[PDB]
Amino acid sequence: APTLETIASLDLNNPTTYLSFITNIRTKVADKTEQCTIQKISKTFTQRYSYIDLIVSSTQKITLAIDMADLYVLGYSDIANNKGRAFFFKDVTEAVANNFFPGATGTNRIKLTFTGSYGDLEKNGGLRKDNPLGIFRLENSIVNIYGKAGDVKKQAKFFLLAIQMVSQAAQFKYISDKIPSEKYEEVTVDEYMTALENNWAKLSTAVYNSKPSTTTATKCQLATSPVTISPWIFKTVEEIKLVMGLLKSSHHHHHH
Amino acid sequence: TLETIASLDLNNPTTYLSFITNIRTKVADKTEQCTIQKISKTFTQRYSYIDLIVSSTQKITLAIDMADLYVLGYSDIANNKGRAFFFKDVTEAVANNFFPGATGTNRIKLTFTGSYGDLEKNGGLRKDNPLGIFRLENSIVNIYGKAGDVKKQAKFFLLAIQMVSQAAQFKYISDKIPSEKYEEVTVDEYMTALENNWAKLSTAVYNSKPSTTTATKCQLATSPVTISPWIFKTVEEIKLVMGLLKSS
Amino acid sequence: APTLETIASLDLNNPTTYLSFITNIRTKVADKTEQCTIQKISKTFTQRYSYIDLIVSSTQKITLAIDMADLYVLGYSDIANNKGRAFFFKDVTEAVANNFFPGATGTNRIKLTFTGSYGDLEKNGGLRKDNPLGIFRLENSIVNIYGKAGDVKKQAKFFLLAIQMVSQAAQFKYISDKIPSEKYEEVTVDEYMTALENNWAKLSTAVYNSKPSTTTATKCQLATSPVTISPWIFKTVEEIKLVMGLLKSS
Amino acid sequence: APTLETIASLDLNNPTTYLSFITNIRTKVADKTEQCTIQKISKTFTQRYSYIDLIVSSTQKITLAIDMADLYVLGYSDIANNKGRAFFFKDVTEAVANNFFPGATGTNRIKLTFTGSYGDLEKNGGLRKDNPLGIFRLENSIVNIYGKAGDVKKQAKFFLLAIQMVSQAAQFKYISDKIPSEKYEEVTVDEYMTALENNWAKLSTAVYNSKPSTTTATKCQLATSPVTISPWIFKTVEEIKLVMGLLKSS
Fold first, then answer.
1. Mutation test of the interface with chain D: which of C227, C230, C242, C243, choosing the one with the most D Cβ atoms within 10 A?
2. CA–CA separation, C193 vs C176, rounded Å?
3. For every residue of A137-155, which 3-state class applies, written as one string?
4. Which residue segments constitute the domains of chain C, with CATH numbers given?
5. Which GO molecular function, any one, fits this protein according to its record (chain B)?
6. Residue D108 carries which DSSP code?
7. Residue D58, helix vs strand vs coil
8. Cα–Cα separations (whole angstroms), residue D80 to A58, A245, C224, D87, D150
9. Nearest to B125 among D136, D143, D188 (CB)
10. Which of D130, D140, D184 lies closest to B188 in CB terms?
11. What angle (nearest 5°) sits at the alpha carbon of residue D248, between those of residues D245 and D250?
12. Cis peptide upstream of residue B224 (ω within 30 degrees of 0)
């Protein structure tokens, strides 16, 4: 089992640290060079897989399995009856999953019957608009599965919170910046939020395809304006920067 | 003649962070303190307008002092004539810079100031006046062209100052205004702690010391800086909540 | 349908009567004998089924169909096209529903397409956090459906206000005592309240499992401490007593 | 100074404990015998003066000087410059103040520049409606004055929250039952709350002057109906019982 780094940990009883935690994630995976003054995920990593911890107390945390290449959540790990236990998304290959959680062995390595797509998560845990985000919301979703028998509905509700408040919060300033430091306050996930969440690659490509502008703030101008991802109408790269925390990386192998 | 530095189409709520960003871009110095934007120390013209647009035929214009983002008054239309209201404590020399379309007897001095003590006393506690795009629009509809009603004017000012000025001062506030027009957000003790402590939080950054190991390259002169319930142990933590430092 | 008792009526234009109305519910359904000095719903009724009225005016009210055994809301009755009309949640048996509303006859007894679980009510009417409680909020939601054609969103919003401000309020003093005495003021349903609403059985069971004690005001002590219903962390039965209006019956 | 009991202590970081704290005060001061099934402050005490602690942390608390005869708050103690420091309301005589805080001596025994009347507190600290109640609000108000140089605004703002959320919270279920155990949530002190706060003796007198009843739940009926404490219109003693945690002694 390779040595994996824990690149960020969220102490859910310290809610004001949330943007510091998100910032750590952006800092760990981002390139040194920006793209139109927007951070972008690095194309390569020495070790692309890593952990992110979500802490409920000194003896209870869930550990996310992460692919830093795209900030995908691949599964998570808890502890049950003193044994380490790992749950992996259905579509995650054995070779990838084998990188994670050396304390989960044998029957405690569990392939879930669903993937991390929002289609699958909402099928099992309800529509995104019915799972509000928030610090305690995330904490409570952890309490409801930690050390417990596997429940797809509650696993899905946890995954909805964790993917949106960790992975896509890092990807989108628009998401991370809505989470209140008032631990018990919640944000409804509306169509403006889902629109961004479902169009991460489309927006990143629009930054990559933009042209250099000697007059504009981001020093870039869209190749084609507007970029419509309804209900958003993006007329400038600046307006894209206001929602983006990280661009998806570009390998420059194909044409856009 | 004064510039209109930003305008908010209350019916196109996605544009709100562009509108806040236009305010910050207009008033900020070219350079940052500890990598945080700060208000510019001087201005060719320190007074400007900010429009709050309800429709093609209806808007309220705020009078803004850009040196500190204070709202000094607003202007509407009543009986087909331009009209301006100014807070009690605004000098007539300052108020005179604003609204050439408001002449005659239609320039009015309000009986209260723009302080939260005054506004909350007349319009209700900040926790009882939730923020939101529609809430702001509706409060404008509730006073536009109407006889002066101190309570409804105070509710407008509570919404406008927080959703314009302090929204520009604090990313924490501006970034929680939902793009869903009819969604609102409560002004909780984390918001008011920031709102009450803009100068204190700016002073901590201006008094910080160089650091070679932190991302902002600053460290607090003494830690923590407490604006409860916030406990600020680093300048990066302050930076995450700030949109504009108070000008040195 | 037999003639059922109407055990309480809330005059929605006299908002300071609210806790008298909730007390009237508690008094009707509570057993004579308390558990750890907390009221509990009687195990037996001669007639478990009864009415609770929500009154908008002298001529406009909604009548809730109530199972007093668990304070379940099963449906409601209004008037539409000058005829008594009733709605019943999807999962309510015909035998149970036929106990209610003798003036809602003919074809005016309607099966709803959703149940009263919070999952069903919130997918149709929105999250508890987006449906604040309040006298006017309740009254308004009644006006938005009374005598109207079926509208699942508005009906579900009415049920959220009704179940939380009648049933759940009677069960939890913590909830009932937060309803504002001003008609037009409202209170957000936060995660403390929703934790209670989701865990009435678990909390009541924790009281039932408690051990006798001579030194505590409730004369009870927790079998295991704490009882955690996040965000609530209960270390005494006294702390549970002070949130509980009515224990689930044993 | 005599050695006085600390009859209750609120750990402001365990907000769920709040109603238990209030209950401890009521139990301590309440007579064995009730009046119209309302608790009444005992006519006498062997030692009427006592302490209540308001804990912000293991190292920082403020102790209230309390007169249990009437739940008057007479002052508070903190620590400044490594020494006990006492503050007493301006109208409290030396004889009374001498009962409290033996660890504060010399010039560390300080006469406040105002009394505990709401008129004095509002002059110095703002209207009650502009000073919302709340667990963290109270904690924040303590932090803002503990060990600090005198500040009449923050001292007054502390007393507004302390008197309302301790003394009058025990006097009035209406106040105590509104405080959320979500510690950041606040309650607006509107006309319904100030009306109760201003009329504690009048409401208590209305209870003592009440007549017997064989039917009502309290076994009392008002001597004259209604008892109006605007905006409240009390037609029954059951309605008064809903809002009151303690009667003033007669």
1. C242
2. 10
3. HHHHHHHCCCCCCCCHHHH
4. 1-250 (3.40.420.10)
5. toxin activity
6. G
7. coil
8. 35, 47, 41, 12, 11
9. D188
10. D184
11. 135
12. yes
